[PDB]
Amino acid sequence: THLRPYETLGAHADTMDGVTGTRFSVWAPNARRVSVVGQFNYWDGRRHPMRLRKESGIWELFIPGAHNGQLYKYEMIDANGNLRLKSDPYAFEAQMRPETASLICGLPEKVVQTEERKKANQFDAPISIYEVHLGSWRRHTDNNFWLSYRELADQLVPYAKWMGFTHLELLPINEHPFDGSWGYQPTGLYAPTRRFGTRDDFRYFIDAAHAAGLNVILDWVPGHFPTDDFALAEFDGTNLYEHSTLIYNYGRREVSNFLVGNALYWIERFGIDALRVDAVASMIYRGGRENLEAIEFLRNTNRILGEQVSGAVTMAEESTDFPGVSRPQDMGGLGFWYKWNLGWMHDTLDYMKLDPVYRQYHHDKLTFGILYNYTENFVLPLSHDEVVHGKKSILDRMPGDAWQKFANLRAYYGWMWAFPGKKLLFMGNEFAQGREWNHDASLDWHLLEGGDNWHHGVQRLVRDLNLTYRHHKAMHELDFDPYGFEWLVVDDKERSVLIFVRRDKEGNEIIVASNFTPVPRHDYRFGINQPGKWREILNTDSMHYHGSNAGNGGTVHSDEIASHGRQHSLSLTLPPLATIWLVREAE
Ligand SMILES: OC[C@H]1O[C@@H]2O[C@H]3[C@H](O)[C@@H](O)[C@@H](O[C@H]4[C@H](O)[C@@H](O)[C@@H](O[C@H]5[C@H](O)[C@@H](O)[C@@H](O[C@H]6[C@H](O)[C@@H](O)[C@@H](O[C@H]7[C@H](O)[C@@H](O)[C@@H](O[C@H]8[C@H](O)[C@@H](O)[C@@H](O[C@H]1[C@H](O)[C@H]2O)O[C@@H]8CO)O[C@@H]7CO)O[C@@H]6CO)O[C@@H]5CO)O[C@@H]4CO)O[C@@H]3CO
Numbered sequence: 001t002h003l004r005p006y007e008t009l010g011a012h013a014d015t016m017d018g019v020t021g022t023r024f025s026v027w028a029p030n031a032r033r034v035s036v037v038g039q040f041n042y043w044d045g046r047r048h049p050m051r052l053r054k055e056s057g058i059w060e061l062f063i064p065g066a067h068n069g070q071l072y073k074y075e076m077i078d079a080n081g082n083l084r085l086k087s088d089p090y091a092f093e094a095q096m097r098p099e100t101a102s103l104i105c106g107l108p109e110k111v112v113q114t115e116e117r118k119k120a121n122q123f124d125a126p127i128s129i130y131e132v133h134l135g136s137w138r139r140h141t142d143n144n145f146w147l148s149y150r151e152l153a154d155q156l157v158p159y160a161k162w163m164g165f166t167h168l169e170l171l172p173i174n175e176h177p178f179d180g181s182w183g184y185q186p187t188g189l190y191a192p193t194r195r196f197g198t199r200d201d202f203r204y205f206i207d208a209a210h211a212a213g214l215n216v217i218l219d220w221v222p223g224h225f226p227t228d229d230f231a232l233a234e235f236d237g238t239n240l241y242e243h244s245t246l247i248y249n250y251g252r253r254e255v256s257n258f259l260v261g262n263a264l265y266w267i268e269r270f271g272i273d274a275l276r277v278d279a280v281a282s283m284i285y286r287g288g289r290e291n292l293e294a295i296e297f298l299r300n301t302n303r304i305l306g307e308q309v310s311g312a313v314t315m316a317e318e319s320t321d322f323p324g325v326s327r328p329q330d331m332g333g334l335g336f337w338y339k340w341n342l343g344w345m346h347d348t349l350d351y352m353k354l355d356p357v358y359r360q361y362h363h364d365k366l367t368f369g370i371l372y373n374y375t376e377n378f379v380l381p382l383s384h385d386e387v388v389h390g391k392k393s394i395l396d397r398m399p400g401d402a403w404q405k406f407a408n409l410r411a412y413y414g415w416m417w418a419f420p421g422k423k424l425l426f427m428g429n430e431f432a433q434g435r436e437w438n439h440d441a442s443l444d445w446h447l448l449e450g451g452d453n454w455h456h457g458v459q460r461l462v463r464d465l466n467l468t469y470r471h472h473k474a475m476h477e478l479d480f481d482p483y484g485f486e487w488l489v490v491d492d493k494e495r496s497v498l499i500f501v502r503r504d505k506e507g508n509e510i511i512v513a514s515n516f517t518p519v520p521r522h523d524y525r526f527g528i529n530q531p532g533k534w535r536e537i538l539n540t541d542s543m544h545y546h547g548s549n550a551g552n553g554g555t556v557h558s559d560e561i562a563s564h565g566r567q568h569s570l571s572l573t574l575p576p577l578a579t580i581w582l583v584r585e586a587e
């Protein structure tokens, strides 16, 4: 059991002959004096001495009477002669603010991943992710208090299900002391934050997501060594976990087990279906500037998870175009299943920001994504990072008076949901929040109060996009196969009209056409592959979303009139600042 140190280290229930208690265990090879202090001892550092197994590094001590509920720490004399209380790095629950003491609770039971949840993570599945910071999705109105994990189970889970998302992605829920880190500056990697309730309340939340048919992705932070509360720095007086500004010693073995075990812990004991690693560049940079320990650590972890928990996937954000992030390790790869497409996010948002009269000069911003699509397995992300620190909301990036901003936004979502790659959308984006994300307050749900409005219109579109994207294989089945995408009109720069097909394994095609200027286009003829009757299944200008309701108004038959090198063509209305998707009707 090298892979799962959490099953041994930390506090666990045990039976000594016939008297029950808790076996404590801490890894510290140097130390020279560790005792167990808690609420079973009156915190007396005399009363209970541990005893090092110098082979392993682990101080171990059974304590009769010690049981679930009670707070504890370890009393440490350093390798360097100093007296410190250390919190258990393997604390599965931590005391509430302020404080620090670890909590005896043991391990939750193992969750078996179902075939349906394994299926939902696969390359050929529709994957649409709702990214959520639990501390700021909603608040109780009269007191501004956080929703608990249990209230989130009753509110967030049905909401994301209704909106048609397949996955919920949580910003890090490991215990962390400052709300402003958003979770990325942790102190307790094995403890769910007490902000929202108990570890069992959190498990209840995950079970509720699962019962509603949602997979759960957790932001996992093996790249951020703790920096607060003296959590993990200089643990036994030496550099135990860190390197000789603070970074993990991934090269060390017990540290790597600690981190790999932590991944196994979330997946196996909480039923987490995927893990996302942020800031991968910071791990593998700063062999020249390459940290080889980190790269090996990432390849390792991905390899082990693939062996130990098939069905679970990892995804990475990496910002330096390191090759093969989502490619096999036995080539140049890092072994991740998916990679965030940051380039696509920058390119398409730059394009949407432009006055539409200038989009003619920047057609490359929309077409470029296809050229490198087949080099990584991409998620198209509109994430929390893009709506803070003066970057504005996505809505406010759009040009024009308010009605034109909303039209632009609708068209862009229509494009994003049709373009190759999986989808991720941060909370608030789906109803076109005006203000930036504030981690210290609720999202602006008030925008949706009162009579039906443009914000409701966007929210209905995102739901229709999700449900349409999931229903039709062509929209999601071959994201990563060139057969899954073909341009129909790639070079109408003058008019900023772009048309492509998405294609399923059976060869059925859905035509996607976007018109990125305020000029409506009538009798727009373009070559198609499958002649017959074609009908809109999505139109971002629909009155249902507070659009102008322009479009093709029923079935349109193709013509045997050659266009764009193709023998048959369609001649359509393309609504202004809008995208439409069309399906072929059987006859
Ligand atoms: O009259 C008291 C109160 O009774 C009811 O509240 C109970 C509630 O129903 C239970 O859930 C329970 O509470 C715990 C809660 O579940 C935990 O989350 C936690 O609370 C934390 C918050 O989650 C966290 O966000 C933060 O809270 C801060 C707020 O973010 C911040 O805005 C501010 O809060 C001030 C309010 O904005 C302001 O309205 C005012 O609050 C008054 C309310 O207006 C009024 O309704 C009433 O509160 C009721 C409540 O409605 C019932 O549901 O009187 C309030 C007078 O105080 O003043 C607030 C400042 O105190 O600051 C807070 C604090 O930082 O941190 C908290 C702390 O962790 O812990 C909760 C209890 O420990 O019990 C409560 C109480 O019975």
Ligand SMILES: OC[C@H]1O[C@@H]2O[C@H]3[C@H](O)[C@@H](O)[C@@H](O[C@H]4[C@H](O)[C@@H](O)[C@@H](O[C@H]5[C@H](O)[C@@H](O)[C@@H](O[C@H]6[C@H](O)[C@@H](O)[C@@H](O[C@H]7[C@H](O)[C@@H](O)[C@@H](O[C@H]8[C@H](O)[C@@H](O)[C@@H](O[C@H]1[C@H](O)[C@H]2O)O[C@@H]8CO)O[C@@H]7CO)O[C@@H]6CO)O[C@@H]5CO)O[C@@H]4CO)O[C@@H]3CO
Binding pocket: 363, 364, 365, 367, 368, 369, 370, 371, 372, 374, 482, 487, 490, 491
């Ligand atoms: O800035 C980059 C790029 O910008 C301009 O290119 C745009 C172009 O003007 C638009 O027409 C459109 O391109 C789309 C194109 O019209 C579609 O036909 C389709 O393209 C598919 C190809 O048909 C198909 O062959 C395949 O392409 C693969 C190649 O077979 C293979 O060789 C390799 O591509 C590599 C090149 O061989 C190699 O030269 C190297 O590339 C650089 C070019 O030399 C250089 O010109 C420039 O490209 C410009 C271009 O000049 C502008 O006009 O930078 C290139 C590096 O980025 O490396 C290449 C990749 O390793 O692999 C490719 C891809 O698998 O598949 C493609 C994709 O399905 O889709 C096109 C994309 O929409 O948009 C482009 C980009 O905006």
